A paper describes a structure:
The bromodomains (BRDs) usually serve as a module for recognition of acetylated lysine residues. The bromodomain and extra-terminal (BET) protein family has four members, including BRD2, BRD3, BRD4, and BRDT. Under normal conditions, BRD4 is involved in the regulation of transcriptions. However, BRD4 has been found to be involved in various kinds of cancers and other diseases, for its regulation of several oncogenic and antiproliferative factors, including c-Myc and Bcl-2.
To reveal the binding mechanism and facilitate further optimization, the complex crystal structures of several compounds in this category with BRD4-BD1 were determined. Compared to compound BDF-2141, compound BDF-2254 had improved potency due to the introduction of a hydroxyl group. The binding modes of these compounds in the pocket were almost the same, in terms of their shared part. These compounds formed direct hydrogen bonds as well as water-bridged hydrogen bonds. In addition, hydrophobic contacts were formed with the surrounding hydrophobic residues, including Trp-81, Pro-82, Phe-83, and Val-87, Leu-92, Leu-94, Ile-146.
Numbering used by the authors: 43 to 166
The structure:
């Protein structure tokens, strides 16, 4: 049974649009989105469909690029570091649930190293 996906809006949370955050959507996410290994991360893990019934017993801070994309589109973040933490949560969760050298991990590691290249320099 899947849990509710993370929130993509919150009226109690302050919103902000920064140049670095606009770049995370325009440039960083939207190129990562099109990588051939992106598809497993474009939406919350469906642990029912995937027959991973232990997934949400292990992963208690789920995060995915579909959630991040909707957060960016919603101006949900206060700064770019908040978004970068979500990306790192997504990558870390994959490495926690899985084992080195698994197909899904090789996908995450390819996206993570792309992600690190793209955020190596942000606009000002
Ligand atoms: N064992 C798996 C399988 C996944 N997945 C989702 C769609 N195809 C593979 C997956 C996807 C994202 C994060 C993970 O930790 C995953 N772990």
């Amino acid at each position: 049974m899947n849990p509710p996906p993370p929130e993509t809006s919150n009226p109690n949370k302050p919103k902000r649009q920064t140049n670095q955050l606009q770049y995370l959507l325009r440039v960083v996410l939207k190129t990562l989105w099109k990588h051939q290994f992106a598809w497993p991360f474009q939406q919350p893990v469906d642990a029912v469909k995937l027959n991973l019934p232990d997934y949400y017993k292990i992963i208690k801070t789920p995060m995915d690029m579909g959630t991040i994309k909707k957060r960016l589109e919603n101006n949900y973040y206060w700064n770019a570091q908040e978004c970068i933490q979500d990306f790192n949560t997504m990558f870390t969760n994959c490495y926690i649930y899985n084992k080195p050298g698994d197909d899904i991990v090789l996908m995450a590691e390819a996206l993570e190293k792309l992600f690190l290249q793209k955020i190596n320099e942000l606009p000002t």
